Amino acid sequence: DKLHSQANLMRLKSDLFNRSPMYPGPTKDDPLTVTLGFTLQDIVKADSSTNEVDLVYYEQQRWKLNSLMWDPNEYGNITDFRTSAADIWTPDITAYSSTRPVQVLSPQIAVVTHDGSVMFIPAQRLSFMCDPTGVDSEEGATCAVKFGSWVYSGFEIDLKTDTDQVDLSSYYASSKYEILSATQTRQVQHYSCCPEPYIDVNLVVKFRERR
Amino acid sequence: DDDKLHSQANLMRLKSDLFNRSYPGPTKDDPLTVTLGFTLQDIVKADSSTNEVDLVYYEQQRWKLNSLMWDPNEYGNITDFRTSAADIWTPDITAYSSTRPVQVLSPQIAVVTHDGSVMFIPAQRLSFMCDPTGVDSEEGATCAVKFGSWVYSGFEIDLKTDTDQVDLSSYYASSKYEILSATQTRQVQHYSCCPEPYIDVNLVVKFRERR
Amino acid sequence: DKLHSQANLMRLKSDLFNRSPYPGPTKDDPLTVTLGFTLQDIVKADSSTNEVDLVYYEQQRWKLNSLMWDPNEYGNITDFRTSAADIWTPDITAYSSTRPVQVLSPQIAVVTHDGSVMFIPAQRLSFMCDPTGVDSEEGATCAVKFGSWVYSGFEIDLKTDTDQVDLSSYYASSKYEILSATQTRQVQHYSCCPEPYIDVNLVVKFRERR
Amino acid sequence: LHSQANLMRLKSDLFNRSPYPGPTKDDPLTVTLGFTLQDIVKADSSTNEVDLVYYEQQRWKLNSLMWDPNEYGNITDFRTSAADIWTPDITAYSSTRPVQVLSPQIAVVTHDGSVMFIPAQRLSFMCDPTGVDSEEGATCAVKFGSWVYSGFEIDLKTDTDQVDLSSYYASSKYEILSATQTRQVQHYSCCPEPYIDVNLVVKFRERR
Amino acid sequence: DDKLHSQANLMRLKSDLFNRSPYPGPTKDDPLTVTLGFTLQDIVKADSSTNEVDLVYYEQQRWKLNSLMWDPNEYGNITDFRTSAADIWTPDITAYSSTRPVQVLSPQIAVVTHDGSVMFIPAQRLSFMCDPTGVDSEEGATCAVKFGSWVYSGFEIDLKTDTDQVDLSSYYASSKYEILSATQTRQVQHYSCCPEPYIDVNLVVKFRERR
Numbered sequence A: 001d002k003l004h005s006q007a008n009l010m011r012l013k014s015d016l017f018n019r020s021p022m023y024p025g026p027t028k029d030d031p032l033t034v035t036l037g038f039t040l041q042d043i044v045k046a047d048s049s050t051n052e053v054d055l056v057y058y059e060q061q062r063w064k065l066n067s068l069m070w071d072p073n074e075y076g077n078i079t080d081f082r083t084s085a086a087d088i089w090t091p092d093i094t095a096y097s098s099t100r101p102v103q104v105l106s107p108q109i110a111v112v113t114h115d116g117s118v119m120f121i122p123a124q125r126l127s128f129m130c131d132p133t134g135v136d137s138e139e140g141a142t143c144a145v146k147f148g149s150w151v152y153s154g155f156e157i158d159l160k161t162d163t164d165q166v167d168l169s170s171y172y173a174s175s176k177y178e179i180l181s182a183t184q185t186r187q188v189q190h191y192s193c194c195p196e197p198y199i200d201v202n203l204v205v206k207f208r209e210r211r
Numbered sequence B: 001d002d003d004k005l006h007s008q009a010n011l012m013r014l015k016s017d018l019f020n021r022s023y024p025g026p027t028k029d030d031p032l033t034v035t036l037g038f039t040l041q042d043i044v045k046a047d048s049s050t051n052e053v054d055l056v057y058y059e060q061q062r063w064k065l066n067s068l069m070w071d072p073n074e075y076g077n078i079t080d081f082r083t084s085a086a087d088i089w090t091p092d093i094t095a096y097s098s099t100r101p102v103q104v105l106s107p108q109i110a111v112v113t114h115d116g117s118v119m120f121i122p123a124q125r126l127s128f129m130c131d132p133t134g135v136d137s138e139e140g141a142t143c144a145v146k147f148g149s150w151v152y153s154g155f156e157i158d159l160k161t162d163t164d165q166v167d168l169s170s171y172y173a174s175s176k177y178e179i180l181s182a183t184q185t186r187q188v189q190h191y192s193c194c195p196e197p198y199i200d201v202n203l204v205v206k207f208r209e210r211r
Numbered sequence C: 001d002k003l004h005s006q007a008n009l010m011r012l013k014s015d016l017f018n019r020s021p022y023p024g025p026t027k028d029d030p031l032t033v034t035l036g037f038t039l040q041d042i043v044k045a046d047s048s049t050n051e052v053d054l055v056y057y058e059q060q061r062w063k064l065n066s067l068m069w070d071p072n073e074y075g076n077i078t079d080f081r082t083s084a085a086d087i088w089t090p091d092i093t094a095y096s097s098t099r100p101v102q103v104l105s106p107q108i109a110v111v112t113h114d115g116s117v118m119f120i121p122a123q124r125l126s127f128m129c130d131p132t133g134v135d136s137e138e139g140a141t142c143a144v145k146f147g148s149w150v151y152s153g154f155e156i157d158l159k160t161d162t163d164q165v166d167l168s169s170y171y172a173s174s175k176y177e178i179l180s181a182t183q184t185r186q187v188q189h190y191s192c193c194p195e196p197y198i199d200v201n202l203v204v205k206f207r208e209r210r
Numbered sequence D: 001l002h003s004q005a006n007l008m009r010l011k012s013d014l015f016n017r018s019p020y021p022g023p024t025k026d027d028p029l030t031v032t033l034g035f036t037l038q039d040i041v042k043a044d045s046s047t048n049e050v051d052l053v054y055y056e057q058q059r060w061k062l063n064s065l066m067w068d069p070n071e072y073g074n075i076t077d078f079r080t081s082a083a084d085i086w087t088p089d090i091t092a093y094s095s096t097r098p099v100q101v102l103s104p105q106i107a108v109v110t111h112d113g114s115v116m117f118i119p120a121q122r123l124s125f126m127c128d129p130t131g132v133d134s135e136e137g138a139t140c141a142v143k144f145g146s147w148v149y150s151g152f153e154i155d156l157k158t159d160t161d162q163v164d165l166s167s168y169y170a171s172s173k174y175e176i177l178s179a180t181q182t183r184q185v186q187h188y189s190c191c192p193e194p195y196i197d198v199n200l201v202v203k204f205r206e207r208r
Numbered sequence E: 001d002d003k004l005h006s007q008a009n010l011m012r013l014k015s016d017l018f019n020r021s022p023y024p025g026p027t028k029d030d031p032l033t034v035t036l037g038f039t040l041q042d043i044v045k046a047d048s049s050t051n052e053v054d055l056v057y058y059e060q061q062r063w064k065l066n067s068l069m070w071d072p073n074e075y076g077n078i079t080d081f082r083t084s085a086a087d088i089w090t091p092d093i094t095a096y097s098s099t100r101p102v103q104v105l106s107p108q109i110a111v112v113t114h115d116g117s118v119m120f121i122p123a124q125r126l127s128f129m130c131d132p133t134g135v136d137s138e139e140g141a142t143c144a145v146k147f148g149s150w151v152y153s154g155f156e157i158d159l160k161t162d163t164d165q166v167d168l169s170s171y172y173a174s175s176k177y178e179i180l181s182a183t184q185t186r187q188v189q190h191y192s193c194c195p196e197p198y199i200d201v202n203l204v205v206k207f208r209e210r211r
C-alpha cells in the first residue's frame, strides 16, 4: 500500500531532477517573483560599542517554477514533497548590511507543491549595522536592513511581501527589548544610468528596553 | 575465527540489502510516530544581559520503519546494528527558540533493530531564549523551549513522550545551577505559514543558583 | 517562448562548462584582474591587540577568451549569473589578516559574452591596524594589501579603475567616520627572484564619530 | 626501491578491494585507552568548565587488517588517514563544547592487524574548580567511552592507571597533583546493557 | 591567440599527473626530505591568564616527489603550475604545543615545478602554550614551540631548514610586541624505547611590549 506511493515519489523526483533541466535561474525573458515575510522572534543583543544589533527570525520565502510542476495523477496523487534545500534552485536573497555571516537555525529543507511552488522558511540569527541610541528612552531605537537579491536586478527577480506588517505573534515575551513596530516594505530603486530597476524589502524595527 | 568472519559478512550483507535496495520520509498517507525524551546534563551559563541560557543535554529519538525490517534468520541471527546517522532518514527535530546553531557533542550513529525501529541519542549544547530573573531566589527561574519537526505537520509526524519527567540521572552535581523541576509535554499549534497543526514537546525547567 | 529562451541559457552553460577544453593564468597567457573596494563599515578597533574589523565589498573583474560566445548562436543572451564555484576565480588575499575572512554575500559571478567576468563578494576582515589617534581630530591610519597568494606579476597583474575607495555606501551611523580611503596598485621585488609581485594597497584614515 | 609500489598494493588490497562494519556481540572488540595530559589551559569558575589539552592513545586489533609482510616486500607497518579505516566512537561523557582536534588524524597499522591512533585535542568539560587557589587544589573527573556500543561489543582497557604527565606543560597556570585513569562498568537509565568507560580524575591547583 | 594550446598543454599535464592512479607518503626505504621556514608577521595576543600566545606567520614547506616530474618539452615548455593543495600529498607538519586548531589565513594552493618540487606557503594563526612573564620588561618574555611530523620518524621524514633565522622582514611594525629575536632550530633526538631518530624544528621567540 505504502510501498507504491513511495515508488511514485522516486519516479517524480527522478523526472524533475535527473531527466530534466537543471534550472539555470531566472532571466529578463523569464522573470521570477519571490515572496518574502519575516517572523521576528527576538532582538537578542544591541551592541552600542560596535553599532551592531542581533535578530533571530524565521524568513519565509516562496516562488514558483514551471520546471517544478506535475500532474498529481501521473504520480499516485502526490501533491507535494520535502526536499533538501541544496537539491533545488534557491534565490540569493541577502541582507545588505550584515556584519557577520548568517547563522542558520533550522533544517535546510524546502517543500515543493505540484503547482511548482516552493516554500522555504530558514530560521536565522543575523548581526547587522545599527545604532541603538534611544533604546533606553520612551521613543526607543530604530533600525533598518534591506534584503534582496545579490546579483539579479528587478528584471530577473521581483520581490513582494503579502503584508507590510512583520509577524510578531512569536515575538519572545521576555526579551530584553520590547517591539514598538516592525514593518517589511517592498521598495523599488531607479537609476538615471541604467534601464533596470532594483527591488529590496526594507525591514524597519523600532524597539526599546523592556521598562 | 571462522564464525567471526562469517557474521561480519552477514552484517555487511544485511546493510547492503537495506540501503542499496529501496524511504523519503513520512507523508499524509504514510505518517510516522517519533518518541522524544530529554536527559538534562547541565545548565552551563545564564546570560541576563541578553536573556540566553545554555543547556547541555541529550535527546532520545525513537521511530520505527517497515523498510528497516529483516528476519534475523536470513542474516546469521543478527538482531540489531549500529550505523552512521547519515545512512538513514532521521527526523528534523528542531528547537523553536534557539539563538545559535546547536552544537553536537556525541557521535552521530544510530542503532537499528530487526523490527525496524531506530534509536538515536544525540548529545548537544543549545543556547535558547530564557529570562533568568529569579534564579537567585528560593523560587528560582522558569524557562521553556519547544522541540518539533520544522517541516512536517501533525498529519506527517506525530510526536509522543514515554514519560513527562525529564531524566535527571546525569545532571551534573556541581553545576552552578540546580534543577527544581523539569518537564516534557506534548503541545500543538498553528503557524501563520501553514494551515496544518504542528506537534512539539515543550521542555520546561525551573532552576536556581546552587546552593 | 519560455521554453526556448531558458533552453538556450541551459545550452550556453552546458557548452561552456561541460564542453570547453581554463586552468588559471600562465606566463605564456597572463591575466589582468581589476580590483575595486567599497568600504561599508569599520565595525571594531581593538587597541589591546591592534586588530581592526572592516566590512567591505571587493569588486573583481577579469576577462577570458574561453568564456566568449556569440549571442546570435544562443537566442541573443548577452550575459548570465553563475555560481562562483563553476568557474575559475583569482586567489586575491589580504596580506595582513589576523582571522579567516568571513564571507557575507552569496558567491555568484556575472559572465558576459565578451568573456568578461564580474564577481563582488562582501566580506568581514580582521586585520593588523594600530588605532592610536582614532580618538583625536587627525584620526588613525591603517593599511592592508590585497593580491594573489601564489601568482607573481608575470601571471596575474592587478589594476584599479580608480584610486579612490568607494565610500558612497559607508554606514552613516558607524562608530567611525572615514577621513579618506585610497586603493593603489604596488609592485614588490625580492623575500631571490626575477619575477615581482603585485598588490593593491588600501589605506584608510578614520576617527571616532563625535 | 619497489617498496612504494608494494605499499600502494598493500593499502589497495586492504582498503579498495576489501569492505569492517564495526564490532558485534559475536565479534567483540577491546580498545586500549591511555591519556597524556598536556595542559589545563583554562578553569572558569563562573561556568564550571575546564579546558584540557591532551592526547588520547587508542589501540585495537582486527583480523581484517592482517597481512604477511613477506608478500609485500617486508612492510611491517604503514600510516594512513584515520578516515580510511574504522575507528571507535570514544566520547567524553561530560563535554560542554565540541572537541577540537589539534593534530593530524593518522593511524599506524601494523602487520598483526593492530592499529594505533593518537589524536591531540582540546576539551571543555564540566568541572568545578573551587579550591584551585588553595594547597589541596580542585578535583575533577571526566569519563570516556563508546557512545553507542555496550560492553558486549566494545570493552575498554588501560595499560596503567597512571595518566602520563611527562609532557605536561611546565609553565602552565595550573600544576597537576595527580591524574589517574580507571576502567568502569556502568548502567545508564537509557539502556539495559552495561557500557564501559575510562574515568580520568585530575587533581590540580594554581602554580606557586 | 594560441594561448589556447598553452591552456590545452597545462590541462593535459595536470590530467596525466593526477588522473593517473596510485603516492602513499614516505617510508624508511623511501625517506622524504621536507624543508621548513617561518616568516613571523605578528604576535597578536599574549594571554597571561591562560598562558597562550597567538602568532600570525607564513610557514614555507618544500619537498620533491619523483611522481610529480615531467619533461617541459612534452608539455609546450611548461615548467611549473599552481594547484589546490587538496590535489596532492602534503606533509603532516604540526605544532606540538598548540592549544587551538590552526586557523588558515591564505588560499591553500601549492606550486609544482617540473623537477617534482613542491612549494607550499600557508599563512596561519596559531595559539600555543607560552608564559608571557616578563613581556613588560627590557629582557622580555621567551616562548618556544616545536614543529614536526605527527606520525613519521626521522627515518621517513627528514625535516630540514635553510636557516635558523626566522624571516622578520615582514613583521608588523605597529604590533603591540616588538621582536627581540626569533630562531628556528632543527633538533635530532633519540629516546629510551625506540631506535629511530625524531626531528623537530624549535621555534623560539623573544619579545617584549612596544615602548
Ligand SMILES: COCC[C@H]1C[C@@H]1c1cncc(OC[C@@H]2CCN2)c1
Pocket (backbone or CB within 6 Å): A080, A109, A110, A111, A119, A120, A121, B149, B150, B151, B152, B191, B193, B194, B195, B198
Ligand atoms: C504543506 O503546505 C505548506 C508548506 C509548509 C510545509 C512547508 C514548510 C516549510 N518550512 C517550514 C515550515 O514551517 C512550519 C512550522 C513553522 C516552523 N515550523 C513549513
Ligand SMILES: COCC[C@H]1C[C@@H]1c1cncc(OC[C@@H]2CCN2)c1
Pocket (backbone or CB within 6 Å): C148, C149, C150, C192, C197, E109, E110, E111, E119, E120, E121
Ligand atoms: C621561492 O619560491 C618560489 C615559488 C613561490 C611561487 C610559490 C609561492 C607559493 N605560495 C605563496 C607564495 O607567496 C608569494 C607572496 C608571499 C605572499 N605572496 C609563493
Ligand SMILES: COCC[C@H]1C[C@@H]1c1cncc(OC[C@@H]2CCN2)c1
Pocket (backbone or CB within 6 Å): B109, B110, B111, B119, B120, B121, D146, D147, D148, D188, D190, D191, D192, D195
Ligand atoms: C533504549 O535504547 C537502547 C538502545 C541503545 C543502543 C542505543 C544507544 C544509542 N545511542 C546512545 C546510547 O547511549 C548509551 C550510553 C549513554 C551514553 N552512551 C545507546
